[PDB]
């Protein structure tokens, strides 16, 4: 049952605030529809951010994975500044039934830690990651202030 998942799942990251992630409802009308949010990496282009991901959770989760795109516009190699859309194994091929919406949204932020330009959503952000680090990182953190604030 993808209900009684989900009604777990909320219960998981309700009780434990301290790691910094919330899973919600978008509306009363169902419970396939979250909002999912992070806190940027401390240490990193990204903290201090506030990060909010668009989630849908098909009819057979959890052995299909949740469909997540960030609402936030972020700058960043493997999420598109436009769509939202995300280049990530666990999110396609590497999906497993034990993974969590919690545990996804935790990987999410991890990717903002250790960015992985090998796989582009955004070729020319990953480009430019290569190209020129410090310049990358200067623009990650004033989207941060701009779009995550």
């Not at 209900?3 to 919600?24: C, G, W, Y």
């Not at 859309?85 to 990717?111: F, G, R, Y």
Request: proline share 9%; hydrophobic share 40%; with cysteine.
């Amino acid at each position: 049952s993808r209900a009684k998942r989900i009604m777990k799942e909320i219960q998981a990251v309700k009780d434990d605030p301290a790691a910094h992630i919330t899973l919600e409802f978008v509306s009363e009308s169902d419970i396939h529809h979250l909002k999912g949010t992070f806190l940027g990496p401390p240490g990193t282009p990204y903290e201090g951010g506030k990060f909010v991901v668009d989630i849908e959770v098909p009819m057979e989760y959890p052995f299909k994975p949740p469909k997540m795109q960030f609402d936030t516009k972020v700058y960043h190699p493997n999420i598109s500044s436009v769509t939202g859309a995300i280049c990530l194994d666990i999110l396609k091929n590497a999906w497993s039934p034990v993974i969590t919406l919690k545990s996804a949204l935790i990987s999410l932020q991890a990717l903002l830690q250790s960015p992985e330009p090998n796989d582009p959503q955004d070729a020319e952000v990953a480009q430019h990651y290569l190209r020129d680090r410090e310049s990358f990182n200067k623009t990650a953190a004033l989207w941060t202030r701009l779009y995550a604030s």
